[PDB]
Design a binder for this molecule. Structure first.
Ligand SMILES: Nc1ncnc2c1ncn2[C@H]1C[C@H](O)[C@@H](COP(=O)(O)O)O1
Lengths: 104, 103
């Protein structure tokens, strides 16, 4: 409930260290094309590939977001703090946002 | 100018000595001072507990800062450790300045 002239979010990239826990935020800009003309297409390995390399599947117009790499969430300095001072770390909870959408 | 914290009221001086114990006095009074003492020494335990206040790094620096690290390569002796004969040794002086701040 904003409209054309109101930004729907703000840029938060910071990391903050509470010393029991660390909260790392990453804000990035993205661009989504139109994949394969809005079509679900089946895809399969070309005949003549080796037996081991055959596959069968489906390609979709949808895109997706993956943050699964570490450096997404950590700067090299924030990574240095973690690995130097700590015997272990695990993720607790995450929060995800999409905002300031533009369709051209 | 050697380093550290200039203090107008520095930690006080703790003084200690062994109370004199005379040896056997003569049996006839003499006002001369005793030169004759029982040879003795004392030993014991001493504890010092200081509470140091810290100032944390707030930096936004992107790239990794220098840290003080031990060499990974193998060696006959380990640094900051006793040797085969039991002698503790410090191989190098270690300053406190590694982390970086802007002016
Ligand atoms: N080592 C040391 N001991 C005592 N006084 C010092 C020392 N170095 C500088 N000063 C003086 C001169 C500084 O401008 C001021 C900072 O005090 P501030 O506490 O930062 O307000 O204190």
């Amino acid at each position: 409930a904003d409209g054309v002239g109101n930004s729907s979010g703000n840029w938060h990239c910071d990391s903050q260290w509470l010393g029991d826990r660390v909260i790392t935020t990453s804000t990035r800009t993205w661009a989504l094309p139109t994949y394969n003309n809005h079509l679900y297409k089946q895809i399969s390995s070309q005949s003549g590939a080796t037996n081991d390399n055959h596959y069968f599947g489906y390609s979709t117009p949808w895109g997706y977001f993956d943050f699964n790499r570490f450096h997404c969430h950590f700067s090299p300095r924030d990574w240095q703090r973690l690995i130097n001072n700590n015997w272990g770390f695990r993720p607790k909870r995450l929060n995800f946002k999409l905002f300031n959408i533009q369709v051209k | 100018l050697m380093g550290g914290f200039g203090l107008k009221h520095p930690p006080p001086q703790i003084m200690i000595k062994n109370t004199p114990v005379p040896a056997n006095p003569p049996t006839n009074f003499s006002a001369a001072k005793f030169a004759s003492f029982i040879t003795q020494y004392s030993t014991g335990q001493v504890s010092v507990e200081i509470e140091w206040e810290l100032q944390k790094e707030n930096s936004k620096r992107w790239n990794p800062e220098i840290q003080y690290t031990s060499n990974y390569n193998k060696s006959v002796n380990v640094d900051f450790t006793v040797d085969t004969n039991g002698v503790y040794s410090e191989p190098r002086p270690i300053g406190t300045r590694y982390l970086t701040r802007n002016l």
